[PDB]
Amino acid sequence: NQIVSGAAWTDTAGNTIQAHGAGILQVGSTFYWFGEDKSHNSALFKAVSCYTSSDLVNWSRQNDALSPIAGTMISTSNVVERPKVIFNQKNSEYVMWFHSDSSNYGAAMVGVATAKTPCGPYTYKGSFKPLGADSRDESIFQDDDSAQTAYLLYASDNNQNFKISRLDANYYNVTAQVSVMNGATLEAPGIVKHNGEYFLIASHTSGWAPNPNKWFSASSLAGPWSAQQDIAPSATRTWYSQNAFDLPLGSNAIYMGDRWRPSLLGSSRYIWYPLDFSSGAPQIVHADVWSVNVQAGTYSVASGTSYEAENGQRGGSSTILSGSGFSGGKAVGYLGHGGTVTINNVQSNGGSHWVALYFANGDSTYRNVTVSVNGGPSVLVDQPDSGGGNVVISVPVKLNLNSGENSITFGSGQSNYAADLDKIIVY
Numbered sequence: 504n505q506i507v508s509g510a511a512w513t514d515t516a517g518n519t520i521q522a523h524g525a526g527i528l529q530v531g532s533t534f535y536w537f538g539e540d541k542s543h544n545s546a547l548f549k550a551v552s553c554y555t556s557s558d559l560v561n562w563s564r565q566n567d568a569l570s571p572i573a574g575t576m577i578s579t580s581n582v583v584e585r586p587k588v589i590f591n592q593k594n595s596e597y598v599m600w601f602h603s604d605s606s607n608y609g610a611a612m613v614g615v616a617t618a619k620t621p622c623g624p625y626t627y628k629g630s631f632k633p634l635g636a637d638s639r640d641e642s643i644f645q646d647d648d649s650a651q652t653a654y655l656l657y658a659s660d661n662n663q664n665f666k667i668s669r670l671d672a673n674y675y676n677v678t679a680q681v682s683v684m685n686g687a688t689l690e691a692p693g694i695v696k697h698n699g700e701y702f703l704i705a706s707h708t709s710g711w712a713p714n715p716n717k718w719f720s721a722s723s724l725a726g727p728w729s730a731q732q733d734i735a736p737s738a739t740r741t742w743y744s745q746n747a748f749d750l751p752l753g754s755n756a757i758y759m760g761d762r763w764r765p766s767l768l769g770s771s772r773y774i775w776y777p778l779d780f781s782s783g784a785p786q787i788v789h790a791d792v793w794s795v796n797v798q799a800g801t802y803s804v805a806s807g808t809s810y811e812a813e814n815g816q817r818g819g820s821s822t823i824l825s826g827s828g829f830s831g832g833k834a835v836g837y838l839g840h841g842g843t844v845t846i847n848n849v850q851s852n853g854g855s856h857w858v859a860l861y862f863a864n865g866d867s868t869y870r871n872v873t874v875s876v877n878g879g880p881s882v883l884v885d886q887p888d889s890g891g892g893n894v895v896i897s898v899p900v901k902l903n904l905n906s907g908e909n910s911i912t913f914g915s916g917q918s919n920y921a922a923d924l925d926k927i928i929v930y
C-alpha cells in the first residue's frame with residue numbers, strides 16, 4: 504500500500520480521514536496520528552482524532568483523543584489546532600499540547616491535556632499564554648538527552664516573532680525562553696534532530712494559502728540558527744502544502760503537510776513526502792506514490808512511465824502551450840469547453856493504477872478535468888490552483904486500466920476550462 508499525496512484518504516472503515524494539523528507519536532511500532540477533525544467544514548473545535556497504523560498507509564480510527572467541553576476554552580465555539588503528543592517517562596503519561604484560541608485568533612494560547620494511554624481519551628487541564636506571551640501555531644519537540652527535555656516551538660507576538668522555549672519536567676508548563684527569531688513571521692513549525700543537529704521546518708505567514716516552507720539548523724536550540732533555505736522549489740509553494748509534522752525515518756525523515764481547502768475545510772488533503780537528508784539538509788522528494796519500510800527505516804519511490812500531453816491527439820479547440828515550467832517545454836491548453844486531448848498507447852498490466860496528472864492552473868480557485876479510460880464512463884479530477892500558468896504541480900487519480908494498451912481522454916463534456924495538462928505519469 505502506498506502514500507499518495509493529495510488523494511482522498513479513507514480509514515479502514517472507509518470513512519474520510521479527519522486529522523489535519525498532524526501530530527505523530529510512535530509507541531512500539533505503531534504510529535498514532537492525532538489531528539483536527541474537520542468533518543463539519545469548520546475551523547471551530549469538533550475533536551482531536553486518533554488514528555493508528557503499522558505502515559503509515561492503512562489507518563484505523565480509534566476513539567477521539569480530545570472532545571469539546573462547553574463553557575471552557577475548548578468549547579465548540581473555540582479553536583483547537585495542531586495537536587502534538589509526547590510521552591513523559593517520569594510520570595508514565597502522554598501529554599498533548601495544542602494551539603488554543605478564539606474564533607478570531609485573538610486569544611493566542613496553548614492548551615494541555617493528559618492521558619495514560621496513547622489515544623486516551625485525554626483530560627484537558629487548561630489553556631495559557633507561554634510566559635504571558637502569544638502562542639498561535641505551535642509544535643512540541645522532545646530531545647534525545649537522558650532527561651528527554653521537551654520544548655515548545657511557537658509563533659508569538661501576533662505571529663511576528665518565532666520562539667523556542669523549554670518545558671518543565673512534567674511537560675505541563677513553559678518555563679524558560681531558549682531562542683527567538685524576531686521578525687521572522689514563521690508558523691507551522693516542526694523540528695527533526697538529524698546527525699546531532701536541530702533542523703527547524705516552518706512556513707511563513709499567509710493564512711490558509713500555501714507558501715515556500717523553509718529549513719533552519721543549529722547545534723543548540725538556543726541558536727545561532729542558519730538563515731532560511733527552501734525545502735522545495737519555491738514556485739510550487741511546498742508542492743501546495745503547509746508543514747504539519749516532520750517525522751524521523753532512518754537516516755532521513757518524512758514531511759507531513761496539509762493542503763488546506765478553506766472553502767471546504769473537511770476536504771483539506773494530506774501531502775506526505777520523503778524528506779531526503781542526503782545533501783546534509785532536508786529536501787522534499789516530490790514522490791507521487793511511495794512507501795515506507797518501517798523496520799529498515801527506509802522509503803521507496805514508485806517508478807512510473809511518463810507521457811507528454813502535447814504528444815497526444817488533440818480534439819476540438821485545445822491548443823499547444825509553450826513554457827519553461829513544463830516537461831518538454833510544452834503543455835496542452837484550452838482543455839475542456841470543447842477541447843480534448845487523448846493519450847494513446849499507455850501500456851499497463853491493468854487493474855487499479857495511480858496516474859499522476861501534471862498540470863498548471865494560474866487561477867486562484869480550483870479547476871477540474873474529466874477523464875475517460877478506453878471510452879469508459881467519465882470521472883472528474885480536481886485541479887487545485889498551482890501558483891501560476893508556468894508552475895506545474897500534480898494530483899493523483901486511481902484509474903482502472905486494461906491489461907495491454909490503453910487510451911485516456913481528457914476534457915470531454917465539461918463546459919468549464921480544465922487546467923493546462925503538461926504530462927501524466929502512470930504508476
Ligand SMILES: *[C@@H]1O[C@H](CO)[C@@H](O[C@@H]2O[C@H](CO)[C@@H](O)[C@H](O)[C@H]2NC(C)=O)[C@H](O)[C@H]1NC(C)=O
Nearest residue numbers: 868869870871872883885886918919920921922
Ligand atoms: C470544476 O471546476 C469549475 C471551475 O473550472 C468549478 O466551477 C466554478 O464553481 C464555482 C463554485 O464553487 C463558481 O463560483 C464558479 O463561477 C465556477 N467557475 C467556472 C469557471 O465555471 C466547478 O464547481 C468544479 N466542479 C466541482 C465538482 O468542484
Ligand SMILES: *[C@@H]1O[C@H](CO)[C@@H](O)[C@H](O)[C@H]1NC(C)=O
Nearest residue numbers: 504515556557558561562563
Ligand atoms: C489494515 O489494518 C487492519 C487493522 O490492524 C488489519 O486488520 C488489516 O489487515 C490491514 N490491511 C492490510 C491490507 O494490511
Ligand SMILES: *[C@@H]1O[C@H](CO)[C@@H](O)[C@H](O)[C@H]1NC(C)=O
Nearest residue numbers: 631633634635676677678679
Ligand atoms: C509557568 O511558568 C512560568 C514561568 O516560570 C510561571 O510564571 C507560571 O506561573 C507557571 N505556571 C504555572 C501554572 O505554574
Ligand SMILES: OC[C@H]1O[C@@H](O)[C@H](O)[C@@H](O)[C@H]1O
Nearest residue numbers: 836837838865892920921923
Ligand atoms: O481562460 C481559460 C484559459 O486559461 C488560461 O489560464 C489557460 O492557460 C488556457 O489554456 C485556458 O484554459
Ligand SMILES: OC[C@H]1O[C@H](O)[C@H](O)[C@@H](O)[C@H]1O
Nearest residue numbers: 584585640690691710711745
Ligand atoms: O488561521 C487559519 C490557519 O492559518 C494557518 O494556515 C495556520 O498554520 C493554521 O493552523 C490556521 O490557524
Ligand SMILES: [Ca+2]
Nearest residue numbers: 830831833925
Ligand atoms: Ca509536457
